[PDB]
C-alpha cells in the first residue's frame, strides 16, 4: 500500500497522467512480481500448497 496508494494512485486518476522516468516503472515491476507468483501458484492447487515455495514464506 505504501507505493501504489501514496505515489501511483493520485496520478492515474487525473485524465492527463504523465510518468516522469522509466526508472520508476522498472522499480514498480519488481515489487508487483511477488504478488503475481502467489496467485499463479494458488490457481493450480486450489488452495493448499506443499511444499511452501520461496515466494510464500522466504528464508
Amino acid at each position: 500500500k505504501n507505493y501504489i496508494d501514496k505515489q501511483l494512485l493520485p496520478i492515474v486518476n487525473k485524465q492527463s497522467c504523465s510518468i516522469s522516468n522509466i526508472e520508476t516503472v522498472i522499480e514498480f515491476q519488481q515489487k508487483n512480481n511477488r504478488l503475481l507468483e502467489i496467485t499463479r501458484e494458488f490457481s493450480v492447487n486450489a488452495g493448499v500448497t506443499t511444499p511452501v515455495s520461496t515466494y510464500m514464506l522466504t528464508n
Partner: antibody
Amino acid sequence: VQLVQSGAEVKKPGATVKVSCKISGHTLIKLSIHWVRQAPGKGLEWMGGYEGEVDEIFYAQKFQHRLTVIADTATDTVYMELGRLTSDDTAVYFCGTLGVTVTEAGLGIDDYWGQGTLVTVSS
Amino acid sequence: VLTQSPGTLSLSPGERATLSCRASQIVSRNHLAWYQQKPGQAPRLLIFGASSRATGIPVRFSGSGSGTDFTLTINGLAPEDFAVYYCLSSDSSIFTFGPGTKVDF
C-alpha cells in the same frame, strides 16, 4: 464531465454579485476549482479557488478581503461572491479546474473550464 | 512576474514558431503550463510540467525550459492553432498568468 455556469446579467456599481458552478460527472471531493477573469481584450488573471484535496481556499493578494468563496461539498457546488463591485469589473468569468498534483513518480492535471459567462457593470 | 516574448508575431503557416516565457524569480520546472485560447471560448491546456504534452494534442507541439526561461516550439503550424498562448506559473500555490503572445498570419 462538463461544468455549467450561471446566467449572464447586468449589474450596477456598489452591489454584490453571485456566480455558481454545477458539477455533473465527478464528486468534487478531489477536483480543484478556481476562478479566472478575462478582460474584454486583455489577459486573464487568477482570482481565487478551492482545492478539495486539502479542503483549503486561496484568494489572490490583490483581491483579499473583497471576495468570499463558499463551496458546498454535499450539494456539489462552489459559489463565487464578489463584494465591493466597481465599474471596471465588466469581464468574462471562467471557472477552470487547473492544478498540478506532483508526486514521486510524475505529474497530474486536467481541464474542463465549463463555458464562462460575462457580467456587465452598466449605469 | 512573468514576461512573454516576442509579443506579436505574424509568421506564415507551415513554419516552426518559437515562443518564450521568462520569470523574474526562480520557479520550479514543474508548476508551469501553456494555454492557447481563441477569443471568447474556454482555454485549452497544451503542455504541463514545461516538457510533457497533454491528453489530446498533436505531436507537433513540444515545450522545454529550465530555471527562469521556458520556451514553447511548434513544428507544424496548422491554420487551426492561431490563438493567444499564455504561460501559467505557480511559485508555491499562487497562480500568476503572463501578458500573452498572439500568433498572426
